Design a binder for this molecule. Structure first.
Ligand code: ZN
Ligand code: ZN
Ligand code: ZN
Lengths: 506, 512, 515
């Protein structure tokens, strides 16, 4: 089915594909002449680590930059806005929907590597389910691969590139470049009729010893790894057959390529999955083309590109796809840990909600549009300083969705109990026990300045002047409150967002 | 399923109040077989198949219900209960108070539209879709209603299922021996000890017990009567056939046991997190048992004849120790009766900044909104009482606060409202944030405006009892001004003449 | 509970279930028309007896054969070898392990009915423990046994329940119309879709179906036959009367479907944590389905006539890829047959430091323990082969290891053992940690020792096939090989001045002696 999709796409997109063997070999030679393969070996060692940090990421990013500098097959930062023309009104609606679905599937696959999944004190069933998910995506108590300050620095750092694969086989396998070319060519030939399997690879290795370097998935790896996928991709570039891997996109050709893909989607019933893991051919081509309107989507250096495909190509409560992402995101929470909660606005009409787990530093933080504008106006002047118009751009529906998803029989700490209880009960969560810590106003805000000094960047929603019946005071933020209340209890004063920022805001 | 788990846990906890009542159920079934006119049963079934039913239809139903009640021994008795601190704790009483409030809303929203109706005329596709989902969920001039009746209170308690009646009708109308009906229902009962019987179960049962083919599986507990062969009624009857299994259906309640029964229900509620839903439609097991027990302190909540009982559960059982969420949901659904397109009068008593009586009136359909509010300025109110409305401030204490904002918020978008003096109404509507509502001032002279004053009070005096004081004009005594009667009399003045009216708001919402 | 496991199996195995009512009724009609129900009554009478013999077993087996001859729903002898494919390598390991555990549970449940349990002169504690076992397996001189038979293997597969038989018996013996029985059982089947019917349920059904009064609800699935009116038999028959419902009882197995059925069962096993019990008694639904499927690759595991099938489930289905706890429990229960007070002979072949054959013999009862062991010292073994026992070392490869220690460790405390050479038995018992056992040395001359040698081999040759080599004595001349078991028997005959003609009883299952 999947190879069928690939073949149909090849046929339909043939006019956008060209022979690029010469340039790919040329790039491989530039890498052989100028790249430090000891640092390649170094990044391979790092990718072998079960758990990796910002020092590890720096080595990877620096090496990717070195590679990018040496090669000519590169993608360029190029945002696309798709408008009615070549693509119809209906085409744009389909593309909008599939990008929404693709966003969920990709985030659910890649995000856990950095955000983490709690794997501690849970039921046998819960552990089985989470173990299944981790296994499907190639992955105290929280399991994560990347421990980093800024997960955005992971974006686009893990692509496979034919020239790199070719240069690494040659140098690291200690064979002549032509040996590597001949071997990948033969693999490319198989790929005209079939996706090559382990038996195909095993057969080839007998006449091409360099192929024993291939470990016979596309997940939790880098371009410096010898995956079958990377080898098949390089092989495709070696052939004289309309291989998809050789497609080039330009701002002039973007829309026609997408139109062509949509033709294939309709004829074959292709779809974006709701299953985390390897991309199917439609998911893969849609992601790769949307990353940039100017490059070679399968085979260029993309390591200097910023942003995700759904950010870089745009079509001019929560969805089903958003809910799946959300339910998966919430698996980062430790249901046994001390968890603070605070809200701004009335429990019957809340406008900001936060939960905070000090031990791990994870937090849930989001906003809601007010129902009662008159009371919202007083709350703004006397408590939170939120401009109602700034809430227009926040994502609706999270109040129900997040409370529904809180783990069963949790214990939540607050200041104080009454509003949180009313809010939880409103969403049917009577199983959650509450601790009222009951600090005096003065003690509760001891660390108010210390907290804002440290964590101001975590919330930009509080813009209005707030008063106490008058004198100006620091606006109340549901998040900063959790933090400062915890700091007061603890006698002193990290942080991971549980929710993706693109889930909190629309 | 969670539903059956609540049922099972209720059975376990309430076993001591369960009884062996097969013999009594079968005795009552025999009494119906001997004494009831089953051609009249057939007649009521015919009327229940009608999409729209009227007072003549309701008469047939109530008469047949009375005939059944006359023949059977398992009957509930009118028994008011007041729950005090004792067996039930102070906190228990708070919980019951809150749950009965929520139950009220859920039941009214399920049942009231059958008689009050929902406008389904000229609306947006979105509004029509939303209202269809509601009508579908509750089993239902552009208004859709099932019962067109003069007094909707006469619908109360007329639709319950009874095992003796189900047994008798299966037997007589299915043309089988009583023993065959008992045998089939017993097997259904046995299934019910372990699960809620579904379509699959009933189909297999039917192959061995063809009497059960009378039961239509794709048919709800809603907008039906005790004369209908629902799966629910069949299961209820089967439960009574067991003499065992701790079936809730067999519980008897007495004044001495009521609090203990409720206490037991609350234990299970806490243990399982049972709740009253805010979803109109079929009752969950907790909703069902609470409703049934609270109807009467002396009877068999599930299985007795209750057709002679007056009042609702929240009226017959009371707890002694602005709008709630539950009340607002009831209001918003009640407002669906209005035709946003129709001529609509509005009138108020008290100043726009401090109104004490508000009414809206749609003459074409006859529906009206009418409610009250406590004054903020008692000095101005006293002047108004003497020279306009004759309202005794103390009489406003029994009225529900919070309706001015809630009703005005809920008025349909771009409604056009007709007014004898638009200035006051404009102020009030604007003060409530509703600048979108267009107004028409009719500008009748004082004399022309009151041409039909006596004619209106003559017909409709029963609709308002708030005007008690002598009102004068500078002096001579005059008839007090009522916001509702003023809407009606002004419309009459315009139309050159002066219908049973329909209250949009339930009385139990206008008064507390 | 166990009903959960049943429901889960029905859900997973739905595709293998089918409607069989017509076929069951047809077979019931064949039985009604052609079976002698007076002989059914006769077998019911035999089954009421506390002690039953070979004449009784003949009556049962013959009646089973008459039934088998009349019905179409029969299983056929079909060996299965489970190989990697539909079943994974790991799946085969699991099945192999559960089949080993099932062997132990079933043998411990059923074997005592024939092998028997000594209940004579024992301590209060021993008698208590033993009665508890007898109670749990449905057994309510000194030896308690239900079946006294020449060949216990003739009990195999003779006691299964069959829906057509149950229906025919209820109809004929209950004196009701066939349709009356069918309808009653249908109503019981309907209840079974939702729960396992209990006595209160049956009581309610009996009110409208008087035929159901024939069912005894107290009585277990143990020590009964297909001619008995157990609740289990009735529920099984009712399970076959339905149209749909995924009743496991309707499952057919074929050589094509066997592996997928096992794969599905293993799916449910993992999901619910199903298991084979370590305790004798009634089978749980997993034990039950695994046993029934494994008996034959071509049949209706629950409902066909299986009385013509030879072999046990662990023999008819095999997996291709010291004692276990399960095997040790089997052993220790088999040893309960021994009278710890009785005269007991013991003899060995091989040196005491390296025995290769061990026998114990209680002449009064006739019971014997007999097993083998592979030698450590091949040089000495080869000489012993030539001058003593004539055993081919390669024939010892199929014998079960670790029995020497296990059996000797399990011997009764303060037992008195009689032997021809005391010194070698002492060394052996000491070497296995049993210095407590008193020995009597008999001290027969070589000639007097073997007076009855031909007479014993004439009577008992079928009891040992291990001695194949020519054995010689230097003058060389050929002599009859020495067997530990035959030696026990002939030494006893020499002392007693005679050899009676008696059937002996093997204490160990042949399945324990060999692997
Ligand atoms: Zn904030
Ligand atoms: Zn009035
Ligand atoms: Zn031997």
């Amino acid at each position: 089915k999947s190879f069928l999709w690939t073949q149909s796409l090849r046929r339909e997109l043939s006019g956008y594909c060209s022979n690029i063997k010469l340039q790919v070999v040329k790039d491989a030679q530039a890498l052989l002449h100028g790249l430090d393969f000891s640092e390649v070996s170094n990044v391979q060692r790092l990718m072998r680590k079960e758990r990796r940090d910002d020092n590890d990421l720096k080595r990877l990013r620096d090496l990717n930059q070195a590679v990018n500098n040496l090669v000519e097959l590169k993608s360029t930062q190029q945002k696309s806005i798709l408008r009615v023309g070549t693509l119809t009104s209906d085409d744009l609606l389909i593309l909008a929907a599939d990008l929404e679905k693709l966003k969920s599937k990709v985030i659910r696959t890649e995000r856990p590597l950095s955000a983490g999944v709690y794997m501690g004190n849970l039921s046998s069933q819960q552990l089985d389910q989470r173990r299944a998910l981790l296994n499907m995506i190639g992955m105290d108590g929280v399991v994560r691969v990347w421990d980093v300050k800024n997960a955005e620095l992971l974006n686009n750092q893990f692509g496979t590139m034919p020239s790199l694969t070719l240069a690494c086989l040659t140098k690291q396998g200690q064979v002549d470049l032509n040996d590597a070319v001949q071997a990948l060519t033969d693999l490319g030939l198989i790929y005209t009729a079939k996706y090559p399997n382990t038996s195909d690879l095993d057969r080839l290795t007998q006449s091409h010893p360099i192929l024993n370097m291939i470990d016979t998935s596309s997940l939790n790896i880098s371009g410096y790894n010898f995956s079958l996928g990377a080898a098949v991709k390089a092989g495709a570039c070696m052939l004289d057959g309309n291989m998809l891997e050789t497609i080039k996109v330009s701002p002039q050709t973007m829309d026609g390529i997408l139109k062509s893909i949509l033709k294939v989607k309709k004829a074959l019933g292709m779809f974006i999955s709701d299953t985390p893991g390897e991309r199917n051919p439609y998911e893969n081509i849609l992601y790769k083309i949307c990353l940039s309107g100017d490059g070679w989507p399968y085979i260029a250096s993309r390591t200097s590109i910023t942003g995700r495909a759904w950010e870089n190509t745009v079509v001019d409560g929560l969805t089903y796809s958003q809910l799946m992402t959300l339910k998966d995101a919430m698996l980062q929470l430790d249901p046994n840990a001390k968890t603070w909660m605070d809200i701004e606005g009335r429990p019957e009409d809340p406008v900001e909600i936060a939960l905070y787990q000090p031990s791990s530093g994870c937090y849930i933080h989001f906003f809601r549009e007010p129902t009662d504008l008159k009371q919202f106006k007083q709350d703004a002047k006397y408590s939170h300083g939120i401009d109602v118009t700034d809430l227009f751009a926040t994502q609706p529906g999270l109040t129900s969705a997040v409370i529904d998803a809180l783990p069963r029989n949790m214990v939540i700490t607050c200041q104080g109990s009454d509003d949180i209880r009313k809010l939880l009960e409103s969403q049917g969560r009577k199983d959650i026990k509450l601790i009222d810590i009951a600090l005096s106003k003065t003690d509760s805000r001891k660390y108010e300045n210390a907290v804002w000094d440290q964590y101001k960047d975590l919330c930009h929603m509080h813009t209005g002047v707030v008063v106490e019946k008058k004198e100006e005071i620091t606006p109340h933020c549901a998040l900063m409150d959790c933090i400062m209340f915890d700091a007061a209890v603890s006698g002193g004063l990290v942080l991971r967002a549980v929710l993706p920022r693109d889930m909190v805001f629309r």
